[PDB]
Amino acid sequence: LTADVLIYDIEDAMNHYDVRSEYTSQLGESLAMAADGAVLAEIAGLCNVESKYNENIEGLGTATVIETTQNKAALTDQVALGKEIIAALTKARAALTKNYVPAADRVFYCDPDSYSAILAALMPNAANYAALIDPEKGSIRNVMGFEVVEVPHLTAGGAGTAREGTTGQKHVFPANKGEGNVKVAKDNVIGLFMHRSAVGTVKLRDLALERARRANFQADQIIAKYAMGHGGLRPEAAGAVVFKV
């Protein structure tokens, strides 16, 4: 998997500056980013959406939890939501420790607006005495032993088929929730929690680019590429948080 670009020598002949560098930068960025999106999509769907198939015989179930109230549009109050996100996270601690995953090394992921729902959930106003947070730069501090990494790019991550983000990408996040059957979806989703491994990536051929001069079009091209796998393992610790209905 890869992308590339090509520079015509005439169009590059008359113009200012340089480029040819920040292009390569854009390559590396696009690639690592795509990898991340693919991973999140994978832990989200694969360790969840599977039907009747759970890890081993033991009953370690993943099993992300439902939410209070309903109607992903019901609130939009920016508060009265974040509290439910707190309650949610506590339920995550609950459903996680049934599977014995130890050490408080756990990590959590959340999309930006909901991160700000946690922000607005505490605040000087409403709520009560300061505990976790501090103003200025919200890092939060921590919570129950997860931590929020503030990921703006959610869903997506497929990066399959054509350069355009549609038409049969590989690792997919389903369009809508109900269907015949499926659980986590695009429209209703909040955050994805894990410990680590919990997931895996193997890589071969590493990461490299090459610059190949081209003839008939009197141009050249720069192509950066790599190959690595993505797969789930031990669903025993994994899951998400999601709105009702």
Partner: protein, 49 residues
């Protein structure tokens, strides 16, 4: 932030952005699809005395 220019009338700036990663199913044509990340200017004119 500001920065000075000399001489001519107005200042121009280039802007380029992002990309979208893709897959290659061997064998295939690497040159059959490109989105051409394009560009655009941003023009700002010194007004007058």
């Amino acid at each position: 932030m500001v920065r000075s220019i000399s001489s001519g009338k107005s200042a121009q700036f280039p802007v380029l952005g992002r990309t979208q990663a893709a897959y290659l199913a061997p064998g295939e044509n690497l040159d059959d699809k490109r989105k051409d990340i394009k560009h655009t200017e941003k023009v700002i004119t010194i007004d007058g005395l």
